[PDB]
Amino acid sequence: QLTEEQIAEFKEAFSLFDKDGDGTITTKELGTVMRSLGQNPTEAELQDMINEVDADGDGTIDFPEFLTMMARKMKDTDSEEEIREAFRVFNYEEFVQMMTAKLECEKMYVRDGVLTGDIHMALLLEGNAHYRCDFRTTYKAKEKGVKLPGYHFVDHCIEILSHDKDYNKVKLYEHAVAHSGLMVSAIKPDMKIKLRMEGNVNGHHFVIDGDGTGKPYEGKQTMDLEVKEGGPLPFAFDILTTAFNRVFVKYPDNIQDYFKQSFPKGYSWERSMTFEDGGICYARNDITMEGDTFYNKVRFYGTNFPANGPVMQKKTLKWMPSWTRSSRRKWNKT
């Protein structure tokens, strides 16, 4: 936690740039301010920090917003400077990269009035290579007045529990938890999931049906998938699995849950996936509900995957989990 002494130190540094006596700095000055405090954030880290604050685009930061950023930074252990330091206490650059990337951690922010989530993702390949992908998802409730959340993270963990040899049948699991890094009537504790996906990857067409269950308030779901057309699939099944609903996220009470609030009418998402060797995907899900069951109409489009790359050669093992875990509260602190 912040202490009084830290706040007064941040306050001094911040105030030196608040030249209008206004209580603000510009977003363009944020790096200069943090360097004045002896910090060395990367550009990528500064962009994340700025996304925490620029929902309405006005390009300034007030002291409470600055304090929140900073409180998040000191809770943060994954900053690039801090991580390298630990290595330099003694080739490890890929480790540094993976650890600073926060794999499977979705950054949730508002950009031009649209709730957006960005994630760094990577597939572990046969032979232990890492195959990177950037995700960007936009989310929009069907009902007009649903209030957009503040900045936050969703820590995801997706895995294949079982499959047949050709991946015509796949059982899938995800566990997701929202947090700041510092129950509603339409949504029952136990829900059912029905899904149909139609897609095309490098021109190969397929249809996949899903049937599942989950616990929206615990952030957990499982699904059984069956390829109905286009099987045996000629590409890595793993590129589809994050297309197979952010309702299934455990939200604490100090973060607005846009997803559970979008029901009964539902919401839709659209996503791009950008892979390191040029492959590109688009996907979309339109999510509705009837009683205790979500219905998912999913579309998936992938192109430009090299004939010879890991996706068209089925060389992926899984989506890699985060390389930094929180070792949690001891039982005595609940």
Tokens at 251, concatenated? 């939200």
Report the C-alpha gap between 279 and 147 in whole angstroms: 35
**Structural biology method used:** X-ray
Q: Answer whether 159's CB lies under 8 Å from 260's CB.
A: no
Residue 177: name the closest of 254, 248, 75, 241 by CA.
248
Backbone phi, psi, residue 134, to 5°: -95, 130
Backbone phi, psi, residue 319, to 5°: -80, 130
Report the C-alpha gap between 154 and 276 in whole angstroms: 23
Q: Enter the DSSP assignment of 189.
A: S
Q: Answer whether 300's CB lies under 8 Å from 238's CB.
A: no
List, in order of start, the domains of the chain with CATH numbers: 1-90 (no CATH), 103-320 (2.40.155.10)
According to DSSP, the residues that pair with 174 across neighbouring strands are 158, 221
Report the C-alpha gap between 50 and 68 in whole angstroms: 12
192: Cβ contacts below 8 Å, ≥ 6 apart:
212, 213, 292, 293, 294
Tell me if residue 144 falls in helix, strand or coil. Answer: coil
Q: Enter the DSSP assignment of 257.
A: -
Helix, strand, coil percent values for the chain (each to nearest 5)? 20, 40, 40
Tokens at 128, concatenated? 């232990």
According to DSSP, the residues that pair with 104 across neighbouring strands are none
Q: Answer whether 312's CB lies under 8 Å from 234's CB.
A: yes
Q: Answer whether 263's CB lies under 8 Å from 247's CB.
A: yes
Tokens at 49, concatenated? 């920090």
How many of the other CB atoms lie within 10 Å of CB of 159? 14
185: Cβ contacts below 8 Å, ≥ 6 apart:
none
The radius of gyration of the chain's CA atoms, rounded to the nearest angstrom, is: 21
Backbone phi, psi, residue 108, to 5°: -100, 115
* Span between the terminal Cα atoms of the chain, in Å: 18
Alpha helix (H) residue ranges in the chain = 4-15, 30-36, 43-51, 63-75, 80-88, 93-101, 238-241, 258-261
Cis bond leading into 149, ω under 30°?
no
